[PDB]
Design a protein around this ligand. Structure first.
Ligand code: ADP
Ligand code: MG
Lengths: 371, 51, 51
């Protein structure tokens, strides 16, 4: 039979059968209970709208993501999300399909063990396998080397790989991602008068960020230009009218990636954690990693980031090496495409964690040889 | 509606066409850049040999 | 639909912008092909000088 390549993610759940080009169903991972009282009788009001249904009734719900930073903080809601994904968005019972979840690097063990225990006890799948979210993004590019920066919505991690041999001592995981950029944008919009507070209006700020923000090639020049002319002010229409005008908030929101001091984080930007991740590698594979830097994940879709990052790394790196940044147009679904490719391989067909194996060793089987 | 229908269909076809064009052209630009870089490495080899 | 009308118009505009980048990528492809041919020739002459 065919395998189910699910990809929990944090912000958008992407799923679909193995062997295709794009995920079959992509929908936000939010579960929102209603918060008001409700007076109409017999309206058929449910107790929790999940997935894309709660992005249409969000006016009277309190949306809450079940995955904070890679890790899962609310297991009941995550179980609900998985149940919805299997039964309503794909309509395939899990009793007859292997599953291939994905997990960020350096995550707590208990999260992974609970994930496998749920998949084997509640949904009762035949066999499931958990894979690191960066190796798949490297599969999708058709490479076999390279250092991949997978800046998702929950957590940004940077896994270097050479000739198929991952370097476990050079993984640099940073917890700044799209959600923190949404919060920072929502916080700097208040400087013009627009106040978004409700958990429903966070979605509106996210839409503003997606449609308007861009990464500046040079920050100081853009700050000077936006403060003199008015060629940058782009307007946007809220879900009820009252258009708003975003000035130099456009390139200040995604600039937080390269200067995490804006949101008070100590660490260095995504332009310098990649160079540090490279320098921890051996001295003889640094040229190949320099030449095959891969971008993935949703948050790396800002217009103009593949040039800013290349300029920064070229500034840091030695002058002789060639710096090349691979930015495929299908960046958002790169991890899932790689997952489909991996699940479609014949050599991989015996790596699944078969159910009888789980019955013999318990949920701690995932840390064992079947990784 | 019918007017909207035709508008929607035509815009969708145009969008898909542009996407396919730009994707294939991206593949082409990748290939030509590979040509350039690999040729450059040949250049370096030749330079070392001659010197 | 009016909003679907605006969406289809915006998507067709996006298609046209992708076509403008299609033109720019075509220019990149052509110039890099010139580079490839020039590199073939220069590498040939360098190897000959090596001989
Ligand atoms: N076109 C875009 N431009 C800018 N940011 C985007 C775009 N699309 C998605 N994002 C950001 O990326 C996030 C989705 O990232 P995604 O790759 O789905 O995360 P995950 O790894 O959990 O799947 C969204 O929250 C949004 O903030
Ligand atoms: Mg991801």
């Amino acid at each position: 039979t065919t395998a189910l390549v699910c990809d929990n993610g944090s912000g958008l759940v992407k799923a679909g059968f193995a062997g295709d080009d794009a995920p079959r169903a992509v929908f936000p991972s939010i579960v929102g209970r209603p918060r008001h009282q409700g007076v109409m009788v017999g309206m058929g009001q449910k107790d929790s709208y999940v997935g894309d249904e709660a992005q249409s009734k969000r006016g009277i719900l309190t949306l809450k993501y079940p995955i904070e930073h890679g890790i899962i903080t609310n297991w009941d809601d995550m179980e609900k999300i998985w149940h919805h994904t299997f039964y309503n968005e794909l309509r395939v019972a899990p009793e007859e399909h292997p599953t291939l979840l994905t997990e960020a690097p350096l995550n707590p063990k208990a999260n992974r063990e609970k994930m496998t225990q749920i998949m084997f006890e509640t949904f009762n799948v035949p066999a499931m396998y958990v894979a690191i979210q960066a190796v798949l993004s490297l599969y999708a590019s058709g490479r076999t080397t390279g250092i991949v920066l997978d800046s998702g919505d929950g957590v940004t991690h940077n896994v270097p790989i050479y000739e198929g041999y991952a370097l476990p001592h050079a993984i640099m995981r940073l917890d700044l991602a799209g959600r923190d950029l949404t919060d920072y944008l929502m916080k700097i919009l208040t400087e013009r008068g627009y106040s978004f507070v409700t958990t429903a209006e966070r979605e509106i700020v996210r839409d503003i960020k997606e449609k308007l923000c861009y990464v500046a090639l040079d920050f100081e020049n853009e700050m000077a230009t936006a403060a003199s002319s008015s060629s940058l002010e782009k307007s946007y229409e809220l879900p009820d009218g009252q258009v708003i005008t975003i000035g130099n908030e456009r390139f200040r929101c995604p600039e937080t990636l390269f200067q995490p001091s804006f949101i008070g984080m100590e660490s260095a930007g995504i332009h310098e954690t990649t160079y540090n991740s490279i320098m921890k590698c051996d001295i003889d594979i640094r040229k190949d990693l320099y030449a095959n830097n891969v971008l993935s994940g949703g948050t790396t879709m800002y217009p103009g980031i593949a040039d800013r990052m290349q300029k920064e790394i070229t500034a840091l790196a030695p002058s002789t090496m060639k710096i090349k940044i691979i930015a495929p147009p299908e960046r958002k679904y790169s991890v899932w495409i790689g997952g489909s490719i991996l699940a479609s391989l014949s050599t991989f067909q015996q790596m699944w964690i078969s159910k009888q194996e789980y019955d013999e060793a318990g949920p701690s089987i995932v840390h064992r040889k079947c990784f | 509606l019918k007017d909207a229908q035709e508008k929607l269909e035509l815009a969708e076809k145009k969008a898909t066409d542009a996407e396919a064009d730009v994707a294939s052209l991206n593949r082409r630009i990748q290939l030509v850049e590979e040509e350039l870089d690999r040729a450059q490495e040949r250049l370096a080899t030749a330079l070392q040999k001659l010197e």
